[PDB]
């Protein structure tokens with residue numbers, strides 16, 4: 001079942017990527033860079049999850065299954081999602097690439113702490129987990145603080161769209177470390193199959209859902 | 224023999240890099256960035272192949288993993304060089320350039336995974352890499368060539384020449400891969416080793432000689 | 444002792460990062476990019492050294508390889524070179540080609556060090572030698588074309604650049620010297636001696652350099 005779920009996921013990612021490509025052909029004032037980002041996220045995630053489906057992107061460690069292909073996915077897909085969110089805030093205004101790369105750095109560090117934590121045991125696991133959560137809190141502070149202020153500097157209509165996609169992505173963000181901690185990688189309260197389903201369903205909303213909401217909202221700003 | 228061939232290759236890469244550096248000192252209207260790219264490609268490939276020569280960049284089928292360490296850097300830089308040639312004298316399309324870089328890096332990764340794989344799984348990964356290569360070729364002879372044409376007859380003629388040159392070499396790599404020990408195992412290991420010594424001399428040094436000379440000629 | 448030394452180091456890195464953050468809040472004409480770089484360097488080094496403290500970022504190869512040092516340097520050292528290059532270019536046009544030339548040389552340098560550490564006999568010293576050649580080219584760029592950019596940006600900037608260039612260059616040569624003398628090379632110096640050198644040096648490079656660099660740039664500010 002776990003294999004089939006991953007095959008299904010990869011197919012949905014492919015469909016998402018194709019939809020964003022078709023959108024890119026009639027771009028409605030959205031720069032090509034934002035369509036490229038929207039396409040790379042699902043294609044990369046799709047490839048990583050295909051490796052799990054084929055039984056390659058996982059291995060046994062501490063008598064538990066480590067789905068290491070998830071970290072290979074997130075270390076690329078999640079910084080790109082934050083870049084998409086940052087470019088939305090900056091839409092129709094001057095870019096702040098310093099703030100964008102601040103978020104990329106925090107996010108890549110966050111995913112790495114997750115991988116190291118998964119490879120760790122006892123207090124060490126929760127030291128790495130904690131550093132990742134601290135990174136996420138700083139990302140959320142940037143998202144609803146200075147990044148939102150950039151969005152507001154680009155007018156009421158843009159800021160309204162940014163706030164919507166910021167809430168959407170932020171809601172999903174907090175789910176990942178919650179599931180991680182509850183599941184076999186952490187406290188082991190939640191069953192492996194439950195965790196597998198969460199990390200199939202959540203990413204459909206993040207890897208495809210977010211960019212549908214994001215691109216449609218930006219496209220609507222076009223006359 | 225395999226060790227000696229790799230030492231020889233690394234020396235040719237060094238000579239190529241030095242030639243491009245000398246060219247960079249009298250640049251003839253070609254930006255320093257294009258000389259930097261031309262120098263990094265052979266130096267990186269040279270280092271990777273030196274690791275094979277020293278018997279480090281392989282594990283034993285024999286997987287020459289140092290080839291993938293090479294290509295994951297050298298091949299995106301070659302595509303960047305080709306994209307900047309198309310855009311020479313005009314506005315840059317960095318989105319299209321990074322599209323090619325992304326496709327190419329993915330392509331090399333599928334090759335490494337395919338090499339580590341067995342049976343149907345190997346050819347699934349190989350096929351994804353081939354699909355990436357086809358999209359790269361479509362971009363090269365489609366939208367990227369259209370950018371070249373927008374930059375005048377002389378530039379477009381040069382771009383078309385280097386595009387055919389690189390494209391000819393591109394298709395050879397996955398062909399040799401599939402025929403050799405990593406794939407169907409029809410070609411002998413020594414034959415594959417010689418192909419992946421000779422091809423790269425034309426790609427890592429040959430391409431940039433043709434590319435830089437053609438761009439420099441536009442200064443006159 | 445080795446574990447405790449690494450814990451202490453990581454805490455100093457955190458303090459350094461916080462100092463740079465506080466400086467960034469009253470930036471005195473220094474772009475946000477230079478504060479971001481100054482903060483990432485110690486935070487990344489801190490995380491890497493924390494992994495050694497926890498007994499994760501090293502392994503036996505008979506001899507101990509502190510591989511987390513290379514994970515540190517492959518990010519921290521190109522960022523230090525970027526900091527130095529942006530100092531030269533302060534108040535003037537950026538040369539990102541020269542900056543990325545230095546990044547490329549430096550990343551190659553650190554990789555040769557890792558491979559050298561994994562190597563034995565003549566092979567070790569071939570890789571070490573290629574790294575030293577990379578370092579010599581970096582020094583030639585630093586005191587040649589990069590210094591000429593600094594000079595083009597006025598007397599006061601050029602004076603500051605020269606000071607931070609000598610500071611970083613002095614530290615640069617110490618690393619491959621300690622490497623060669625210690626267990627990774629000739630094995631003249633004891634493990635504990637090498638460990639202390641690679642605790643003390645980085646405090647001067649990861650925090651010291653940016654204190655001197657940022658203070659010198661901030662001093663150029665009018666008002």
Ligand SMILES: CCCCCCCC/C=C\CCCCCCCC(=O)O
Nearest residue numbers: 095096097098101105108109476483
């Ligand atoms: C965890 C390691 C990841 C580190 C990657 C990013 C490090 C930050 C380095 C440089 C920041 C680049 C800022 C670009 C400045 C452009 C001007 C602007 O728009 O602000």
